[PDB]
Amino acid sequence: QTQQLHAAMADTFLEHMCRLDIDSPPITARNTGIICTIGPASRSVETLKEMIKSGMNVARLNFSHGTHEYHAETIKNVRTATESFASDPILYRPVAVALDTKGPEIRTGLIKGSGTAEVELKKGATLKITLDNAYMEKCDENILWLDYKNICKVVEVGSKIYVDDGLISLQVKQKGADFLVTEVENGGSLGSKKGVNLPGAAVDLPAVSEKDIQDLKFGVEQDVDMVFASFIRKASDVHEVRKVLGEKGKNIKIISKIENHEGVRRFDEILEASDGIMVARGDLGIEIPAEKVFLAQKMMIGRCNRAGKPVICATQMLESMIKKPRPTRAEGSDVANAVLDGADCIMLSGETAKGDYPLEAVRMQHLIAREAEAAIYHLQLFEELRRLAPITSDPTEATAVGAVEASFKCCSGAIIVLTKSGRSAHQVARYRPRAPIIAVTRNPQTARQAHLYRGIFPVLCKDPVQEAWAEDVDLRVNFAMNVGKARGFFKKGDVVIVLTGWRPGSGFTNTMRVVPVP
Amino acid sequence: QTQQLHAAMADTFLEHMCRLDIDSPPITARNTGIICTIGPASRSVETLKEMIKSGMNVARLNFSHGTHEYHAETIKNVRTATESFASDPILYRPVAVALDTKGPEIRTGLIKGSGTAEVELKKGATLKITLDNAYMEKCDENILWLDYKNICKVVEVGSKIYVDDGLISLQVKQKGADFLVTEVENGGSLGSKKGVNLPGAAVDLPAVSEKDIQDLKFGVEQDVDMVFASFIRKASDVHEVRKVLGEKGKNIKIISKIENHEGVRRFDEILEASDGIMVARGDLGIEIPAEKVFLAQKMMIGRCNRAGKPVICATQMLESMIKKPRPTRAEGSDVANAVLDGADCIMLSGETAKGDYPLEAVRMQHLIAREAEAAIYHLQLFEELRRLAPITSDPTEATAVGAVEASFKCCSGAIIVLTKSGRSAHQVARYRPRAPIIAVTRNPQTARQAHLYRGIFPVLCKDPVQEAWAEDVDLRVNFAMNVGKARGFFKKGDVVIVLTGWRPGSGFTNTMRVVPVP
Amino acid sequence: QTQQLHAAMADTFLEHMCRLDIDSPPITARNTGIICTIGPASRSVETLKEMIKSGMNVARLNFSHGTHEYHAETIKNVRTATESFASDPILYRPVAVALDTKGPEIRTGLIKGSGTAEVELKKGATLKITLDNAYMEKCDENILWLDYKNICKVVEVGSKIYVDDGLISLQVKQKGADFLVTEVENGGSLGSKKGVNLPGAAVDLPAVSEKDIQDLKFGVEQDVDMVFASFIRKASDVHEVRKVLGEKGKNIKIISKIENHEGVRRFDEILEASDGIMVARGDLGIEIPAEKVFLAQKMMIGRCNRAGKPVICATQMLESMIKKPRPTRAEGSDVANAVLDGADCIMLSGETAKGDYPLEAVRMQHLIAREAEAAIYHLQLFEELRRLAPITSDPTEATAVGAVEASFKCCSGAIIVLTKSGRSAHQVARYRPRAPIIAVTRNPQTARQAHLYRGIFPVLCKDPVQEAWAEDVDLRVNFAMNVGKARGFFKKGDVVIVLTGWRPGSGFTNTMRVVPVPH
Ligand SMILES: O=P(O)(O)OC[C@H]1O[C@](O)(COP(=O)(O)O)[C@@H](O)[C@@H]1O
Ligand SMILES: O=P(O)(O)OC[C@H]1O[C@](O)(COP(=O)(O)O)[C@@H](O)[C@@H]1O
Ligand SMILES: O=P(O)(O)OC[C@H]1O[C@](O)(COP(=O)(O)O)[C@@H](O)[C@@H]1O
Ligand SMILES: [K+]
Ligand SMILES: [K+]
Known part of the structure; x- marks a missing residue:
């Protein structure tokens, strides 16, 4: 049997595992x-073409470093590599570009006037x-300058301060106007x-x-x-990012990075305002005990799945592969486990x-995923998603869940x-079918x-709009059929589910057909 | 709220995660x-005392390396460290000693008559x-000798052969009398x-x-x-190990290490014959695709949980901590996830x-575990374990499950x-209560x-047997109460579940009491 | 297999049915x-002995009719019949006596001066x-007198009024000071x-x-x-019954009869104040549409199961057996279905x-029950009762649920x-084990x-209290063992669950033992 279908049929999670x-x-x-x-x-460009073939879907640019010029050139290269495949629309894979902000920071000053x-x-x-600021270049083992002017307003006696990616730990013992007397808990080289x-x-940084x-x-x-927006602590932070992006940037998706205690505790209000979430495990595990990161990861993935909003699992997933051709077992x-969780x-x-x-790291993520x-226990997952979801008058929602149900019944x-706009396909994805969703868009x-x-699996239709709308729809359905055949998703005579609407604009998806692949 | 009790009460797994x-x-x-x-x-001895304080329960001796003398001295040191705490029976922690066998191996010959x-x-x-054997010391890039005399009987044209830690990969293109012509798939330095x-x-190695x-x-x-027995492929392998241990070794537990395709496929018969299982991820991940390891791990943990037999998750869990003081997010x-799985x-x-x-690695495993x-979803886990378990006439089983039920009802x-013998405590642990099981034994x-x-949590009672059996039982109950208090498991007036039997000797556990902590 | 154990193991209710x-x-x-x-x-006395042998557990006296003398003699007869079995305490079955009140009523006057x-x-x-009251003996097809002086305060234009067990139906068209003009909806002989x-x-009757x-x-x-208290509409009605019973009657259990819309709507406050509930389907189906009675029945039984309070299903269960030796299929x-519901x-x-x-009617209820x-789906029922139940510091509750779980595990x-007081046994019953609960009490x-x-199954221990408390407890457990053996519940070597406490007096049940039945 294939696709863990034997496991799929288990009546209990334990038997599913077995x-x-x-x-x-x-x-x-x-x-x-x-x-x-x-x-x-x-x-x-050359490596990027291989990154695409190996499975990269989204190119992330980390604006923590590099100039606008450098990043502009990366993006140019990504598009060159991406478009090198555009001549065959059956095989072309869209590749997204994500900008990951530096975000607000707290930094110490210079030790002894030196950088080193x-x-x-x-x-x-x-x-x-x-x-x-008199001490901003005279940091030593007795006096530490830092650049966060309001630090005193936001800590108390008993508060911890972590320095250098959590290497050093301090506890506040006395607060002054413009100073804090601390005791070193974890020492080290500052x-x-x-x-x-x-x-x-x-x-309270901006x-x-x-x-x-x-x-x-x-x-x-x-x-x-x-945009992957750093250090999101509250809904109003998301609103500020949205306002900066403005009218011109209104269709850019904002993915809030949750990276501290505040962000975790205010998660609901943040999610409601965001287009999606990144579990930013790196900084998150500096801010909170490392042993608690898996809790915040499963919390966030569960609540994102419940809300139908995208969630990303990030950081150190295949860390050893920086240096080695194969990953560790952990x-x-x-x-x-990130995929099992729902990421x-x-x-x-x-x-x-x-x-x-x-390339090996991309290929490995592809293989594991x-x-x-x-190995997902779809029988329980689908039951829970359907129960947790509202009843609505929304016809598109009813169509989507009916297509997902039909897809399980016929193993499509x-x-x-x-x-x-993507929305009809997003509505299907939120119910987590086993079958791939081929979203045809112009x-x-x-x-x-x-x-x-x-x-x-997004596929970009490049054909002119046909004069007869029914033919225009059939053209796009046929395109999807050719894509699935060429990518080995299915073959002639297999059964597939097709979703269309009753007229041309957005918002009319209402038609589900169960059809053999021609 | 504490102990993820809010999550404990969720009516779905999804809500539990949220x-x-x-x-x-x-x-x-x-x-x-x-x-x-x-x-x-x-x-x-000094490091071992700290390993104990940090949470080590079992010292594993790897007989892949070291003489008998070396290992004898390790064991002596572990006992010295362990017994250094014996003077306070309330606080003494038992520490087990496990022997992990080298097991059978297949090795190549010498490159240029040289080892280097x-x-x-x-x-x-x-x-x-x-x-x-003429080529046993003339291995080169054309001719590779190895020591597995039956190799031709067990591979086919199309078969893969891996060399080193799966560093090199070969595909069999022709089989001869005494030889195999291969093509190099993954190259490298041999x-x-x-x-x-x-x-x-x-x-078919022994x-x-x-x-x-x-x-x-x-x-x-x-x-x-x-004993952690290497490279267990089949029930008869476990029987051989048991026979070697013989009468003198009849009470030593045999933990089969599952490390290849055969062991995974023959898992059920191996489990039935074994005292427990090690998911030996290191070798397992050389033998089978690394992307499939988590499947084998969850399969084995689930089936061990279903059988009520111990399972160990092994290898690379905190690998980066060999060199670093803190683990990666993965x-x-x-x-x-190993604990969530059921290890x-x-x-x-x-x-x-x-x-x-x-020490930091031990402390980190303690914290995460x-x-x-x-974070375990005991509501579903307990329901599944109870359903998956037989109806029996065994009174001790009915007592154990009644105790676990009672323990959930009063949050004991x-x-x-x-x-x-440990058996009554084992029977409780197989139902996976939230509350710790203090197993008092002489x-x-x-x-x-x-x-x-x-x-x-095993506690070793050192007091003489009291003349009156009822007093002897109460003495051991009191000891357990004092252990729990001293270790911070519970405090005066909390409730605890106490399991005893109706007469001395193994096999009569039948009595469940709900008692306040004195 | 026996006891529908194959169905017991089904993974879904649908398969359980199949x-x-x-x-x-x-x-x-x-x-x-x-x-x-x-x-x-x-x-x-003679029939009552056979009613007991056929399965009667509770004798109900209906105080709608009969003098005190008549009812006293019934009660005397029930006791005579019940005590006729007392000489073998192993075989004696307790029989309860229940008084079911007439309750408040609304009655019309006399037609044309005549009773007939x-x-x-x-x-x-x-x-x-x-x-x-001038018309109290001159009821005719134009003028109907009735005795409920406050009727006008409690009905509106549009209200329905039902007369003679809902035979006749009236709709209020106009309200006056001391009168109502109605239109006849369902006609008939008044x-x-x-x-x-x-x-x-x-x-607002008392x-x-x-x-x-x-x-x-x-x-x-x-x-x-x-007491089965009639026409309970609200918690304060239960409180009044409790107050009337007073100190002397403080240990008499009050079972509220739910028999109208108000009682159903105010059910929660009524249950909370009562010792138990009767789904009084007869009057309930006069007051509310007949087609809705199964809704009120299942609502009340489910909520009583959720509260751990006794509920009775009553009225016309085997009606045709008034005249026939066998019941209908309905x-x-x-x-x-009443037992499946949870009654x-x-x-x-x-x-x-x-x-x-x-006697045939009692025997038939026994057989069907x-x-x-x-046929109860204990797998889902036990899961739901356990989930719906609190986490509790109460040790007796932990013990009860542990015992019920153990009882399923070993098929005890x-x-x-x-x-x-009964409470330890009540606490076990509320989790709905398959195995019978033998409650030993003095x-x-x-x-x-x-x-x-x-x-x-209550058993009344008549032995003196033994000097050693341990021996006294053992003696009662042994009594229970002998009862179960004699009644064919179990035999030597079967396994049974035993619940005791750690000291004498109510409230200390904390001990669960799994014991082979001795020889
Ligand atoms: O997911 P969205 O943005 O609502 O778009 C789905 C829409 O696409 C269609 O299938 C085709 O619309 P167009 O022909 O305008 O592309 C509609 O019938 C449907 O309403
Ligand atoms: O006084 P002893 O011989 O330790 O017995 C104490 C209780 O421990 C139990 O032996 C449990 O031991 P096992 O778990 O080995 O069955 C009961 O049978 C007995 O009543
Ligand atoms: O010997 P006694 O006083 O009848 O008590 C025997 C056992 O019965 C129980 O009283 C139970 O009675 P309740 O169900 O009324 O609490 C225990 O508390 C006690 O240990
Ligand atoms: K960044
Ligand atoms: K970050």
Whole structure:
């Protein structure tokens, strides 16, 4: 048997686990989007073509470093590689471009006037934090300057301060006007201009920094598809990002990065305002105990799935592959479990941006994701999603859930969906069918953004609009059939589900057909 | 709220995930046993005392390397460290000793008559494998000798052969009398006496090597608690191990290591014959595609949970901690997911045997395990375990399940179980209660072996047997109460479940009491 | 297989239904209490002995008719019959006595001065209702007097008024000071002193009538175990009954009869104030549309199961057996579905009080109940009861649920429970085990009242208290063992669950043992 179908039929989750079968091969289609950070290892046109062939769906640009010029050139290269495949629309894969903001930061000053010097902090010693700029280049083991002018307003006696990616830990023992007397908990080497984290604080840094405002404007100019917004703490932060993107950027998707205690606790209001979520495990695991990160990951993925909004699992998923051609067993497991949890997309950072084996890391995420998709317990998942969802008068919703149900009953090879804005295909994806969703659109931005949703394989129709609308619809259905055949999703005579609407604009999807592949 | 109790009450798994709460702190008790491989980083008496304080429950000795003398000294050191705490019976923690066999291997010959010389294998080139001993010390890029005399009987044209840690890959193109012509698929530097793996082969090497027989004899002499038996492919392999251990070794637990396709496929018969299972992910992931490992892991943990037999998750769980003081996000996730899967125990190999941060690795497994134990969806798990279990006439079974039910109903701080052999405590653990199981025994081997089962906290009663049996029972109940109080499991006036029998001797557990903590 | 155990194991309710097996015989024990109304057909000592042997657990006296002398003699007869079995305590079955009140009523006056004369009401005709006592003996087809002085305050234009057990129906067209002009909807022969119902009205008649006060006093004097209180509309009505019973009657259980729209709507507050509930389908189906009665029945049984309070299904269960030796197929089905619903007790009224086949009716309820009990889907029911239940600090609750779980795991022949007040056994019954609950008590009133809960077989221990408490406990457990053996619930070597506490006195049940039945 294939596709873990024996497991699929189990009446209990435990039996489902007992039936997982290494000799049950997956289907060809892989539903989980792969987001790859582009950097020195992966930025040439030549490598990018291979990244695409290996499974990259979204190119992430990390604006923490690099100039506008550098990023503009990366994006140019991504598009060159992407479009090199455009001559065969059956085989072309859309590739989205995501801008990931630097975001607000807290930084220390210079040790001893140097950028490279360091000092030793001993566990239990005193360290005074000063805001007084006289000390901004005279940091030492006694006096630490940092740039967050309001720090005193947001911490209390007992508060912790983490320095240099959580390497050093301090506890506030006394608060002054413009200073904090701290005791070192975890000591270590303190260097220059290090990152500061304030675990449990309501930090009042602006939603977007001066640099972020410039970067977001540049993302609009560059026609990016989505923004990963750093350090989102509250709904109003999302609103600020949306306002910066403005009218011109109104169709760019905002993915809030949840990376501290506040963001986790205010998650509901953040999700409601956002187009989707990134579980930003790197910073999140600096801010909160590392042993608690899996809780926040499963919380966020569950609530995103409940809301029907895309969620990304990010950071260190295949970390060892920076240096090695094969992942660890914990890494394999992490990727599989993220898909099992419900993540729409999984991400690579240093693995693709700077490591020695970027192609292998992409291919590995592809292999794991496809195995894990088969191992989902759809029988329980679909039951729960359908119960948790509202009853509505919305005809498109009723059509989508009916298509998903039909797809399980006939084990279809695909659900084909015509969509202008993406929405009809998003509505199908939210019910987590096993079958891949082939979303046919003429809208290039729809095609790129659809990668955010589990299961959506976007295909970009380039044909002229036919004079007879019924023929225009049939043309697009036929395109999807050719795509699925060419990509090995299904073959002639297999059964597939087709979703269309009753007239041309958006919002009329209402027709479900069960048809043999011609 | 605490212990993820809000999530505990969700009526769906999805809602359960949505309710996981980083602000809901776990209980003190940590139920998942921690097994640590001992080596140069962890073998001193001083480090071993800290390994115990940090949470080590089982010392694993890897007989792949080291003489009898070396291993005898490790065991002596573990006992010295363990017994250094014996003077306070309230606080003493039993520590088990596990012998992990080398097991059968397939090895290549010498490159240029040298041990250190190497040759380059080009992808797509020919490589002939010979059994002809004339070439046993003349391996080169054209002719590779190996020591598996039956290899021709167990591979076909099309078969793969892996060399080193799956570094090199070969595909069989022709079979001859004494030889195999292969094509190199994955090339690389081939050195001397490297490990060979035969994916998908029924390999007919002995269940136990000549050296393994010697090592098992030594394990009996050294009073080890359990054997982790390598490369178990079939029930008869387990029977061989059991026969070697013989009458003298009849109470030593046999944990079969599942590490190839055959072991996975023959899993049921192997489980039935074994005392427990190790998911040996390292070798498993060389033999089978790495992307399929999580399937085999969940299959094995599920089936072990269904059978009520201990299962260990092993290998690369916190791999990066060999070199770093903190784990990656994928590693944190791996540990959490292993416990969520149902693993009785989790394991450390190079992280404790040879790494720079053995204590931190133990502490991290402790932290994660405890968080993940709270995050289990006991509502569904208990329902499934109860349904999957038989109706029996066995009174002790009915008592155990009644105790677990009662423990959920009153949120008890513990299930206290008097047990000679461990069996009554095992029967409770198989229903996966939230509350820790304090298993009071006078039998030191029982106490050590109990670490194999999720949730059992073994405590070794040292007081003489009291003249009146009722007083003797009460004394042990009181001891358990004092252990729980001293370890912070519960406090005066909390409620606990107490299991005893109606007369002395094993097999009469039949009495369940709900008692306030005095 | 037996006891519908193959169906018991189904993974879905649909499959459970598909597995029900006419060739799978039930166990001996029957868990659903049978309440039998005693009347001319069933009041002799001799018949009462056979009613007990046939399965009667509760004798109901209907105070709608009969003098105190008549009812006292019935009660004396029930005790004589019940005590005739007392000389073997192993075999003695407690029998409860229930007083069912007449309750407040609305009655019309006399037609044409006569008690026997009648008049014809034609659909669509006018009929004026008067409260003016000048007309109390001059009811005719134009003027109907009735005795409910506040009727005008509680009905509106559009209100329906039902007369003579809902035979006739009237619709209020105009309201005056002391009158109502109505139109006849359903016509028919109107006689004298007929019962009036006010569907949908908040009727403000007293909780207890003048006759009820007398009857309750008599119930206390006669040591009855429970009162079925008529026409309960609101919690304050229950409180009034409780207050009337007072100190002397404080241990008499009050079972509220739900018999109108208001009682159904205010059900929650009524349940909370009551010891249990009767789904009084007869009057309920006069007050509300007949086609809606199964809704109110299942609502009340489900909510009583959720609260852990006894519920009785009553009225016309085996009606045709008043005249015939066998029931209809609808009646067989009604009894089985009541037990499947979750009813603690089922009831017989004219079937036992006045019909030609009282013993056959009791026997048939016994047979059907025992078949239906096996056909319950305990797998889902136990899961739901456990989930709907709180997490509790109460150790007795933890013990009860642990015992019920253990009882399913080993298919035990019984759960034996020592109880003074009944409560420990009640706590087990509320989780609906398959196995019978043998409740051992020295308290005779506990023993009789225990019949209200599904599954409890009360046994009355008559042995002296032993000097050593341990021995005293053991003696009672042994008694239970002997009872179960003699009644064919289980045999030597079977396994049974035993519940005890850690010291004497109520409230300390905390000990669950799994024990082989001794030789
Ligand atoms: O997902 P969206 O944006 O609502 O688009 C779906 C729409 O696409 C259609 O199938 C075809 O519309 P067009 O021909 O305008 O592309 C409609 O019938 C339907 O309403
Ligand atoms: O006094 P002992 O011989 O330790 O017995 C104490 C209780 O422990 C139990 O032996 C449990 O031991 P097992 O788990 O080995 O069956 C009961 O049978 C007995 O009543
Ligand atoms: O010997 P006694 O006083 O009848 O008590 C025996 C057992 O019965 C119980 O009283 C139960 O009675 P209740 O069900 O009324 O609580 C226990 O508390 C007690 O240990
Ligand atoms: K960034
Ligand atoms: K970040």
